[PDB]
Design a protein around this ligand. Structure first.
Ligand SMILES: [Mg+2]
Ligand SMILES: [Zn+2]
Lengths: 73, 1312, 49, 244, 34, 132, 98
RNA sequence: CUCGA
DNA sequence: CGGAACTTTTAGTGCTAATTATTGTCAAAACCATTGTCACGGATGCAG
DNA sequence: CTGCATCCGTGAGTCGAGGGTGTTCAATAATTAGCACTAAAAGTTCCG
């Protein structure tokens, strides 16, 4: 949460001169926050998962490529 | 009367107590809960209608837009259950709900709506079940285990013992709702009252009462009494009632009406109370120091100056006494404080409360609730009214209100869902009275305080969790939506309904796949009472309270059936007659007893209604017409066994088998067994492997006819009649003319299931049991599934068992088995393993299923066809290939013999590596089925097209048979017309033909199209291996009385001990485990099996020599009319003299005898049964030696014992690895039998080697053989060269630890 | 090393990190951790040599 | 290093991942945003909250669970920090340095053998073949039968009748170490001489089972190979059943 | 093997007392001030 | 072979001597192909080559070019065992206090600064100040 | 002897869930049939004894690990020290007879 | 989650 | 084994078109679980 | 300044088997992943 909340705060601070004053600051910050949350969701959808399968439960498993090596004496 | 499945082989029954209630449906709880979960019910009853009426209707942010709800509907399943189990898709159903979206006009409060939008919309899917309560989630069968949790309401725990290291008991009251926040009042070791909400910081309990709009004088009026002090002319006299002065010593001279009563320094007893009440005095003389120790209750304002003279919760002094006397106030009300009546707990909590107002109280409760966001009279009051009083975030149901009204001893049973202030006043008063010394506390180990949730109530919570997210999504969509743009179908989405229900039904702590190898296991796994899961305790962090059994579990929770190991008592089993209450409790049926006669009716009594009435003994001896033969009887008043009379009883037990579960009721002579032995036998009957040829048990319990019928392993006939066409695949049942439907009827088709794979790799098979022309009735069986025999459960097989030590081969508990068992094809079990090969889409080219495998021999390619898949019916050995698959050599982790060639002259990219599915080492099975799934857009080979052509031919044959029987029924109907309408029936004939062609086109579309797979794979080939395993030295076998052993060594027939008749014994057990492990019932079962084998031998000798039916009928009549007053009471003269020969053919192998659990047969019945045959009365027969051939002194006991085969075969645990795969993050061998991994040297084994010497043995085991990168290769080179010489080197996992410590801010270095 | 393999690992690691502790691997468990000869059995004569 | 926290493709949609990677990505992202905020002349409280986020990420990466609240990534479960990768029963000091998995081992069900002596026990034929592969390879390279080790490996895999007398020659006086999976005292690990028995189970003396405290109701024990001359003489001299 | 959760004299001999601090009463008995 | 093990604190110059590269980007791996990023968490010029005797670019793969770097990547081509011992560093712009010496109970920074643990927790979390 | 006493003769006195001894015994043996409430009291008494070992072996292993970690830092390295201090061995005569 | 010790 | 015709590719140039990460936001915009484990040491505030 | 009591950090056995999941607005500025075109070098049969 605080990375995307502070990134929304940076993008609100760096674009405050375009505020035409037709509304209040709260709806502007609301739309900026939801747009940054959806942009972070899109960027997370492009990224691989962070905590999908544990690595200790990966060597003793079928089709392990780099966890186990075919190297015998 | 007797049905036809009992006329083939009637079981001899014992016992004397007659039953009144039949055996109910054993799978009725989960089926009733799932029928309650999905049913159309008005007025807001159970099911999905309550969740559809709680959330809907939804409105926007005052935008005059509403989304209404009308009804719902369920769609048809798109596949059969067998095709759903094969393909691996979920067994779901569409959820068609009709909605209504109305929107009001702008700038109008009563705008009449002219734009109504009613449209059926589709949201998510719900998983359905079969006729046995088995869900199909992903291929396999997973059943949901019911959870046993605490009932919603109020509780009074006693924090005694070593709580807070003070040596003083405590009292805390907790309010537990079904969904919402938790309230907890608790006491100190001191006298201060405090409260806590969801385990937060400690804050006083009076501040939430002041936040409920209450003043301090109302607090001291509600909680404490009122002592009246009047201002007389002198001495400030006081009113008195003599009851309040109990236990208090008089510090003055109590005198009234000019007469002294109590001297200064005298305590008042009850006779003094009676003497002071007989004089009827009210006003006494009290000194001025008594009021100076008391506290004034209410605030008294002055009338002269208009100020406050004495603040609340403040003790009085002499100057304040002079002020209140000079002001002119006569009435002064104080409090009453005494350690025996009302302890000081409200005044100290009021004086420790720093805020005496409401706004600062809201500020403090907002500070303790949410640290941060400082409000100004907005968020604190809204949070206080939203945390406890809103119906959305507080969900006290009807059972919670019922428990709250029952534990508080009130009259009403219903109410509202939200809480109230007066309930908080009453529970604080109940805490005050339970501290004061009236009433008792409620134990947490009470079944009346524990509620069980089924699959429907657990699924409705996840449906509501998804529905509130749907409500939030449609709120955010309706907040900006305008008018007349869209039909309401994009306002809602499928997710997260289907995602949440898939997360619930697929992966949970209770959603586990069942073990499918035993119908006993299928019938006891659904009747499992688990205490783990969400909203419960963990199995590793449980105390000594939950594991022990309470005496309220008599008839509801089985005490002898619990798993030994990490969780003992946490996993409970439901009883036979235990039923689920409407609120969620467990009841037991009982026989209603009047003053003189026991009325034969049933009455369901819960656990809370147990202590009120009295329940008599189950096996009490009674006379006819409802009379007890004895005056003294054994009963229980409130959970304690006592001795009562014949007139105080009001209820009686309905049966004697209501205490044990369905798995423990099949063990004969259970009352002669220890609880540990019966507990180990009840957990070993759940793992019996079915054999190749089932055999009936000789000593049954009568419950064997219910487990095979009410389970889903057999095919029960729905409509009785005659059987026309008996085949191994299908069974044709012809419906009789009386039970036939009056329109569009016909015959029934029962399709049996063939050899397929189960969850525990057990080959389940169904075989027919009826012949051509045989008539059947309603409820009769048609086929025998796994471990069944003519509609009766049969787990193992009976064998001849002798009890003698034989050369140390039965040393501890081991079993000796002759060669006659393995020669008669008895213990051969069939196992089916699933081997799958997937061709994933990788880089530099996709993989192929071609048969041109490079660098392989022609002897290995002799099993492959022109496509590359092994045939159906070709035997394979361990190490052979099954399906060919090539690799474009883009993958990593190559062998070094290929890595050296690639380093010298490689990387051409034309060559393909041999990465194919192969048979594992050890198993030798026969390929019986090949399944090929193909993604759309991928070309197929000729064998796959042959497979789909065979499936299309089988489906065409099945649909042709269905068309033929439908046309036969329609031709019978058009013949029945002729006893403008024949045009109508010809139109129906043409419509049925067009519907058949449309169903055939739909089946062709289902067969020819492709199925969905993983993202990035081409096709999956599944090969089914069928290995046949037999008995060998190394397996595990056990009986029913909790005696287990390992088979030692196979023995020929001539080496076995044999009697004087010449018959050799097959099993030689050990009689030394009988006195220590106290299971004496196995000898009684052996004697009963010997008597049954004697009757069977007499029957076979009477049959083999040709004999008339009169003598056989007389012998069966003499065997069935034994003088024991049994409940069978059969006669052989009522038979039709044709099925008596079938009865003799079914009884020529033995005599099945039934013996009840606690009403079993006495020893005299077994003695007269042995006296009926030519067997000796003592039961011990002389046996000769096998090798030497002499005569054994002290002749042993022989007979027949029912013994099972465990799922612990020696060809599944044996493993040996020289050199195999190694992990990369740590240079260490792997572990397991699937992968080539060795065992693990434990941490205690290193200390065991350190207890010895062996520095070189411990150094070679840890470094050379396990950890060294350049040490094991040199050791392998030196061993084969003839040089036993190792090198120490350095371990690699220590370097991993060094890099892990060096990755932090701590430096570590190896010096010189 | 004999205390880091037991419980309370971070406190004894911070105790041995700020002090500059130098242990001479004279023991039983800390030679199992390194992976050399134990000075109890046959390796005790090697340690004496 | 990346070889200690691997991120690998797993067949299908599933991926196999270490816990620390997400914390490292969060630390790198917060350090990059902290380096970008100081150049654009941000107000003091924005870079103050950025420094607070970076300090929270640092002391969550060093030891998660010691802060005011342990952060989580998914599954409502705390991520495994570098301090959590050392402590516990899954760290290096309990799982991969003290008690480790060993090669040349086996496991089978016990069986009562009343015809064998006190200094010997039984051993199956397939376990004796799989446990003593390099001794068979060395004795086949010594004799004039197999030139290379590939022909000897094919002769072992084919299961001919010429490997059996070699197996009887190499297990003449070669004792093995037997091991019970619960080991309370020192008598749970003893040495025995193997004999070739037909079956799939390990035979044991009835008198030595009183020291093992293991009945015959389905108990499984492990075997080990000494593989070293000093280890063989050690098992003959001190770990023998006749000496204990 | 463990678990978790003025008297008569049979033998005939002489009587010995360690750390003697005692006086004799008038009834013939012996009383101990220690 | 080696004598007693010495354990002490780690200087930043010693971490800079242990380092063989600077991680600058939070991108770990690409989703479409599993080649590592240029300067992310998984790299080649910081830690080493993925495959044995094969560079990341694929220009140098023979044994004659064993031990030389490329023109743009700059990876010394070698075996895959090099990626197990080599480490990197992160140049943090702001100093970070350690948690093992701060909340050890008893702590090491609090005993050295003769200051209780709550005051240093208030200073480091920017809710209180300290003067110098 | 006690188990054959419970086998042939009556089992005697049993236990209650509070921890003390119930004042009502079991007047049956294993050869003759058992009542339902007697078997209920017997399985309550046996469930605690079955759970005792399962809840005790973890503490036994923890105590073994602790006593190993305290010990093993000592080696018998000398033959004789030449001291004069020791303890006086006395039999256990306090309490019972011997 | 579970099974045997 | 020595030669030219025949045939199949792994490396270098480009070039368009799906993957990358960016700009907008301006009626207003009521918010995660916990909660049914036990038992030690010792650094902390009150709170006299 | 000598103690009271309230929390906060540590832990709670071992060896095998089966089965494994994540809460999305529009429109673009650059940007790199296929992919056509040569490249004869490199590879593969064939005639004396
Ligand atoms: Mg055992
Ligand atoms: Zn390169």
């Amino acid at each position: 949460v605080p990375d995307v909340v502070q990134e929304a705060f940076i993008k609100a601070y760096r674009a405050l001169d375009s505020f035409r004053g037709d509304s209040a600051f709260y709806t502007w910050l609301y739309r900026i926050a939801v747009n940054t949350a959806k942009n972070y969701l899109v960027a997370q959808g492009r990224r691989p998962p962070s905590s999908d399968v544990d690595a200790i439960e990966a060597e003793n498993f079928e089709s392990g490529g780099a966890l186990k090596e075919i190297s015998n004496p | 009367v007797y049905s036809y499945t009992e006329k083939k082989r009637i079981r001899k029954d014992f016992g004397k107590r007659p039953q009144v209630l039949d055996v109910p449906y054993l799978l009725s709880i989960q089926l009733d809960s799932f029928q309650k979960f999905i049913e159309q019910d008005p007025e807001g009853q159970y099911g999905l209608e309550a969740a559809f009426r709680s959330v809907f209707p939804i409105q926007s942010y005052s935008g005059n837009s509403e989304l209404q709800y009308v009804s719902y509907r369920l769609g048809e399943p798109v596949f059969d259950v067998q095709e759903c189990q094969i393909r691996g898709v979920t067994y779901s159903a569409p959820l068609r709900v009709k909605l209504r979206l109305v929107i009001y006009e702008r700038e109008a409060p009563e705008g009449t709506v002219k734009d109504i939008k009613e449209q059926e919309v589709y949201m998510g899917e719900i998983p359905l079940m079969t006729d046995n309560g088995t869900f199909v989630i992903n291929g396999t069968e997973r059943v949901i285990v019911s959870q046993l949790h605490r009932s919603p309401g109020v509780f009074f725990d006693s924090d005694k013992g070593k709580t807070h290291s003070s040596g003083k008991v405590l009292y805390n009251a907790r309010i537990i709702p079904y969904r919402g926040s938790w309230l907890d009042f608790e006491f100190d070791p001191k006298d201060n009252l405090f409260v806590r909400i969801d385990r937060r910081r400690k804050l006083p309990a009076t501040i939430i009462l002041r936040a409920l709009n209450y003043t301090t004088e109302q607090i001291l009026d509600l909680f404490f009494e009122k002592v009246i002090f009047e201002i007389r002319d002198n001495k400030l006299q006081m009113e008195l009632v003599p009851e309040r002065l109990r236990g208090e010593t008089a510090s003055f001279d109590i005198e009234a009406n000019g007469k002294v009563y109590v001297e200064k320094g005298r305590r008042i007893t009850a006779r003094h109370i009676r003497q002071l009440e007989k004089d009827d005095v009210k006003l006494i003389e009290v000194p001025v120091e008594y009021i100076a120790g008391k506290v004034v209750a209410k605030d008294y304002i002055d009338e002269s100056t208009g100020e406050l003279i004495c603040a609340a919760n403040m003790e009085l002094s002499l100057d304040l006494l002079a002020k209140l006397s000079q002001s002119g106030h006569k009435r002064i009300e104080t409090l009453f404080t005494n350690d025996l009546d009302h302890g000081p707990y409200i005044s100290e909590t009021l004086r420790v409360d720093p805020t005496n107002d409401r706004l600062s109280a809201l500020v403090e409760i907002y500070r303790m609730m949410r640290p941060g966001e400082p409000p100004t009279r907005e968020a604190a009051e809204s949070l206080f009214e939203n945390l406890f009083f809103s119906e959305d975030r507080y969900d006290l149901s009807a059972v919670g209100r019922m428990k709250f009204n029952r534990s508080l001893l009130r009259e009403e049973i219903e109410g509202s869902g939200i809480l109230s202030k007066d309930d908080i006043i009453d529970v604080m008063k109940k805490l005050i009275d339970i501290r004061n010394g009236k009433g008792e506390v409620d134990d947490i180990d009470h079944l009346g305080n524990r509620r069980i949730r089924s699959v429907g109530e657990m699924a409705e919570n996840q449906f509501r969790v998804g529905l509130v997210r749907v409500e939030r999504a449609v709120k955010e969509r309706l907040s900006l939506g305008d008018l007349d743009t869209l039909m309401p179908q994009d306002m809602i989405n499928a997710k997260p309904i289907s995602a949440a229900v898939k997360e619930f039904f697929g992966s949970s702590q209770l959603s586990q796949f069942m073990d499918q190898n035993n119908p006993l296991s299928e019938i006891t796994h659904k009747r499992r009472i688990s205490a783990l899961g969400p909203g419960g305790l963990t199995r590793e962090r449980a105390g000594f309270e939950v594991r022990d059994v309470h005496p309220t579990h008599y008839g509801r929770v089985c005490p002898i059936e619990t798993p030994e190991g990490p969780n003992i008592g946490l996993i409970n089993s439901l009883s036979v007659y235990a039923q689920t209450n409407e609120y969620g409790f467990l009841e037991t049926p009982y026989r209603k007893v009047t003053d003189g006669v026991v009325t034969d009716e049933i009455h369901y009594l819960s656990a809370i209604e147990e202590g009120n009435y009295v329940i008599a003994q189950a096996n009490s001896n009674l006379d006819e017409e409802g009379h007890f033969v004895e005056d003294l009887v054994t009963c229980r008043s409130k959970g304690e066994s006592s001795l009562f009379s014949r007139d105080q009883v009001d209820y009686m037990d309905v049966s004697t088998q209501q205490v044990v579960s369905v798995g423990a009721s099949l063990i004969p002579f259970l009352e002669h067994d220890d609880a540990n032995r019966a507990l180990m036998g009840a957990n070993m009957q759940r793992q019996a492997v079915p054999t190749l040829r089932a055999d009936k048990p000789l000593v049954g319990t009568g419950m064997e006819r219910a487990v095979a019928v009410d389970s889903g392993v057999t095919a029960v006939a729905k409509r009785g009649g005659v059987v026309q066409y008996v085949d191994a695949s299908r069974i044709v049942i012809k419906v009789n003319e009386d039970e036939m439907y009056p329109g569009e009827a016909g015959i029934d088709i029962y399709n049996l299931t063939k050899y397929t794979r189960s969850n525990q790799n057990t080959c389940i098979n169904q075989m027919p049991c009826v012949s051509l022309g045989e008539p059947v009735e309603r409820g009769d069986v048609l086929a025998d599934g796994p471990s069944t025999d003519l509609g009766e459960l049969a787990l193992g097989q009976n064998m001849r068992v002798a009890f003698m030590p034989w050369n140390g081969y039965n040393f501890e508990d081991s079993i000796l088995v002759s060669e006659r068992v393995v020669q008669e094809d008895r213990f051969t079990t069939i196992h089916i393993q699933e081997l799958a090969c997937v061709s994933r889409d990788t880089k530099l080219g996709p993989e192929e299923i071609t048969a041109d495998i490079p660098n392989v021999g022609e002897a290995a390619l002799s099993k492959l066809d022109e496509s590359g898949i092994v045939y159906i019916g070709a035997e394979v050995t361990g190490g052979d290939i099954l399906v060919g698959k090539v690799t474009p050599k883009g993958e990593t982790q190559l062998t070094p013999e290929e890595k050296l060639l690639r380093a010298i002259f490689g990387e051409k990219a034309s060559d393909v590596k041999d990465s194919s599915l192969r048979v594992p080492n050890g198993v030798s099975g026969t390929v019986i089925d090949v399944q090929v799934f193909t993604r759309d857009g991928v070309e197929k080979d000729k064998r796959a097209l042959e497979i789909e052509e065979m499936q299309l031919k089988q489906a065409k044959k099945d649909l042709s048979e269905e068309l033929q029987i439908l046309e036969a029924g329609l031709f019978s109907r058009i013949r029945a017309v002729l006893v403008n309408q024949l045009e109508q029936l010809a139109e129906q004939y043409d419509e049925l033909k067009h519907e058949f062609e449309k169903k055939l086109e739909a089946k062709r579309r289902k067969i020819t199209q492709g199925d969905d797979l993983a993202p990035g794979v081409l096709k999956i080939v599944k090969v089914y291996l069928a290995v046949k395993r037999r008995i060998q030295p190394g397996d595990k076998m056990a009986g029913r009385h909790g005696n287990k052993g390992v088979i030692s060594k196979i023995n020929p027939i001539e080496d076995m001990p044999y009697d004087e008749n010449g018959t050799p014994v097959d099993i030689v057990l050990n009689p030394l485990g009988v006195p220590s492990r106290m299971n004496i019932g196995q000898i009684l079962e052996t004697h009963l099996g010997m008597a049954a084998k004697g009757i069977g031998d007499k029957i076979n000798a009477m049959l083999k020599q040709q004999q008339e039916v009169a003598k056989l009928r007389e012998f069966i009549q003499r065997a069935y009319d034994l003088g024991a007053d049994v409940r069978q009471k059969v006669d052989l003269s009522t038979f039709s003299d044709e099925e008596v020969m079938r009865l003799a053919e079914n009884l020529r192998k033995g005599m099945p005898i039934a013996t009840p659990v606690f009403d079993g047969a006495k020893e005299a019945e077994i003695k007269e049964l042995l006296k009926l045959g030519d067997l000796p009365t003592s039961g011990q027969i002389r046996l000769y030696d096998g090798r030497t051939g002499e005569q054994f002194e002290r002749p042993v006991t022989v007979g027949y014992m029912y013994m099972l085969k465990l799922n612990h075969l020696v060809d599944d645990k044996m493993h040996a690895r020289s050199t195999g795969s190694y992990s990369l993050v740590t240079q260490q061998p792997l572990g397991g039998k699937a992968q080539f991994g060795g065992q693990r040297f434990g941490e205690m084994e290193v200390w065991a080697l350190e207890a010895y010497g062996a520095a070189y043995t411990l150094q070679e085991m840890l470094t050379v053989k396990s950890d060294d990168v350049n040490g094991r290769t040199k050791m392998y080179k030196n061993i084969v060269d003839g040089n036993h010489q190792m090198e120490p080197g350095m371990p690699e996992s220590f370097n991993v630890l060094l890099k892990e410590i060096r990755s932090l801010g701590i430096n570590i270095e190896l010096e010189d | 090393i004999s205390a880091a393999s037991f419980q309370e690992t971070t406190r004894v690691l911070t105790e041995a990190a700020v002090a500059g502790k130098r242990d001479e691997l004279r023991g039983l468990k800390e030679n199992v951790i390194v992976g050399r000869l134990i000075p109890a059995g046959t390796g005790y004569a090697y340690h004496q040599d | 290093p990346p070889d200690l926290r691997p991120l690998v493709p797993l067949d299908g949609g599933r991926f196999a991942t270490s816990d620390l990677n997400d914390l490292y990505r969060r630390v790198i992202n917060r350090n990059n945003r902290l380096k970008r905020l100081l150049d654009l002349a941000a107000p003091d409280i924005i870079v103050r909250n950025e420094k607070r986020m970076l300090q929270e990420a640092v002391d969550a990466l060093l030891d998660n669970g010691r802060r005011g609240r342990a952060i989580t990534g998914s599954n409502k479960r705390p991520l495994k920090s570098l301090a959590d990768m050392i402590k516990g029963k899954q760290g290096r000091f309990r799982q991969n340095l003290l008690g480790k998995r060993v090669d040349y081992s086996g496991r089978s069900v016990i069986t009562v053998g009343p015809y064998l002596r006190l200094h010997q026990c039984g051993l199956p034929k397939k376990m004796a073949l799989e446990l003593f592969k390099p001794f068979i390879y060395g004795k086949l390279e010594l004799r004039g039968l197999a030139t290379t080790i590939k022909a000897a490996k094919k002769m072992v895999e084919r299961e001919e009748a010429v490997v059996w007398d070699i197996l009887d020659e190499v297990i003449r006086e070669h004792p093995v170490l037997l091991n019970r999976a619960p080991t309370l005292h020192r008598l749970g690990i003893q040495a025995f001489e193997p004999v070739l028995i037909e079956g799939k189970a390990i035979q044991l003396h009835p008198l030595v089972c009183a020291a093992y405290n293991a009945d015959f109701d389905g108990d499984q024990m492990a075997v080990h190979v000494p593989l070293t001359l000093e280890a063989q003489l050690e098992a003959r001299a001190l770990m023998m059943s006749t000496n204990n | 093997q463990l678990t978790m959760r003025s008297i008569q004299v049979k033998n005939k001999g002489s009587i010995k007392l360690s750390n003697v601090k005692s006086v004799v009463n008038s009834s013939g008995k012996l009383v101990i001030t220690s | 072979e080696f004598d007693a093990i010495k354990i002490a604190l780690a200087s930043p110059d010693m971490i800079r001597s242990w380092s063989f590269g600077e991680v600058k980007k939070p991108e770990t791996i690409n989703y479409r192909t599993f080649k590592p990023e240029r300067d992310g968490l998984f790299c080649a010029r910081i830690f080493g080559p993925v495959k044995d005797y094969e560079c990341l670019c694929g220009k140098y793969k023979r044994l004659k070019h064993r031990g030389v770097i490329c023109e743009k990547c700059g990876v010394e081509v070698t075996q895959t065992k090099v990626r197990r011992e080599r480490m990197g560093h992160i140049e943090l712009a702001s100093p970070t206090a350690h948690i093992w010496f701060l909340k050890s109970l008893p702590s090491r920074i609090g005993l050295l600064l003769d200051m209780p643990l709550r005051d240093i927790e208030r200073v480091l979390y920017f809710e209180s100040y300290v003067v110098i | 002897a006690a188990q054959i006493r419970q086998l042939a003769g009556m089992r005697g006195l049993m236990a209650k869930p509070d921890g003390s001894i119930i004042e009502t015994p079991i007047t049956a043996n294993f050869r003759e049939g058992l009542n339902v409430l007697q078997y209920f009291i017997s399985t309550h008494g046996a469930r605690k004894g079955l759970a005792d070992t399962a809840l005790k072996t973890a503490n036994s292993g923890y105590l073994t690990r602790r006593l190993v970690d305290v010990a093993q830092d000592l080696v018998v390295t000398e033959d004789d020290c030449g001291t004069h201090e020791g303890i006086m061995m006395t039999p256990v005569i306090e309490g019972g007879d011997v």
